[PDB]
Ligand binder design. Structure first.
Ligand SMILES: *[C@@H]1O[C@H](CO)[C@@H](O[C@@H]2O[C@H](CO)[C@@H](O)[C@H](O)[C@H]2NC(C)=O)[C@H](O)[C@H]1NC(C)=O
Length: 302
């Protein structure tokens, strides 16, 4: 059997603050993800931010952890599937330290710090994968802090410079066969929010220089796949709770980069299913309805 590492990448699934604390879309995606894990399998699930709408959690004991997360992703197939989490802007309007601290309460919730590195060894093989989970809010600023709803500047300068330096160092030293970087804010996006200037300027150069396989993100509520002339992939998966068909920033993304987009208003949303083997990295976009909408693959690093 071909060695393989599999995981679900879902973003902006944070339900709602008012009863019942979830949306029809979040429930649909919970079911859809449970079906995919049940039939295709998944080693873990990656959350791309905006875990609890609209102002995160107050503390590690916030009832929202059970109402919006635990109780929602409760289907049998998801019982013991680990989640590796990072924060979004809405999470930062609340207590992120609380989401980090919740890791000690719920076994499947993994969120050791604002930004961290994940390392995986594809089973029955020597090919490795590294995933760098970033906190784009502390790095660029909280979009919610500005009327423009864009991260115009970080709240703390030392924190932002410190993370970037860490990214630079790590990406330079990374030797894995596959290197993924994940953050809430998008580098490229044709939707409502569009490209995050802070990431295009500070992160993208790094992604390129160090031949990262792909950048995974959420924030814009839809599904997109973009790839630049160097083959760098951009997996945007932020439709776990909402679906916005906005193409406002279509012209703000370099010509030809957009390879796939789905943001139908009537859709219940969707997510991305990543499969990594010694041969390649495949990314399948699946609608909450269970249907595959698009699939592509990325090569391993030299
Ligand atoms: C953010 O959340 C953290 C974690 O829930 C809060 O810190 C806890 O506060 C209790 C108060 O009784 C302490 O006994 C715990 O030791 C703290 N836990 C940790 C992990 O530090 C914190 O108060 C919250 N901050 C804000 C501003 O709401």
């Amino acid at each position: 059997p071909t060695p393989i590492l599999r995981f679900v990448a879902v973003g902006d699934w944070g339900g709602v603050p008012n009863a019942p604390f979830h949306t029809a879309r979040e429930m649909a995606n919970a079911k859809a993800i449970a079906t995919t894990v049940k039939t295709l399998g998944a080693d873990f699930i990656l959350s791309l931010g905006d875990n609890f709408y609209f102002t995160g959690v107050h503390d590690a004991k916030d009832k929202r952890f059970q109402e919006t997360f635990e109780d929602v992703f409760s289907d049998p197939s998801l019982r013991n599937v680990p989640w590796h989490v990072l924060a979004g802007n809405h999470d930062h309007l609340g207590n992120v330290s609380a989401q980090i601290a919740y890791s000690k309460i719920s076994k499947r919730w993994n969120f050791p710090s604002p930004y961290y590195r994940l390392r995986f060894k594809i089973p029955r093989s020597n090919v490795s994968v590294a995933i760098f989970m970033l906190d784009t809010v502390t790095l660029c600023g909280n979009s919610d802090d500005f009327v423009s709803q864009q991260p115009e500047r970080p709240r703390n300068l030392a924190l932002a410079r410190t993370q970037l330096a860490w990214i630079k160092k790590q990406l330079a030293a990374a030797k894995e066969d596959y290197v993924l970087v994940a953050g809430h804010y998008p580098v490229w996006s044709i939707a409502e929010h569009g490209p995050t200037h802070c990431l295009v300027k500070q992160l993208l150069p790094l992604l390129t220089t160090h031949k990262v396989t792909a950048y995974l993100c959420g924030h814009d509520h839809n599904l997109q796949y973009l790839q630049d002339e160097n083959g760098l992939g951009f997996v945007l998966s932020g439709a776990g709770n909402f679906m916005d068909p906005s193409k406002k920033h279509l012209r703000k993304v370099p010509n030809g980069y957009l390879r796939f987009h789905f943001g139908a208003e009537n859709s219940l949303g969707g997510f991305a299913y990543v499969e990594i083997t010694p041969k390649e990295m495949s990314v399948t976009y699946i609608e909450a309805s269970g249907k595959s909408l698009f699939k592509t693959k990325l090569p391993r690093r030299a």
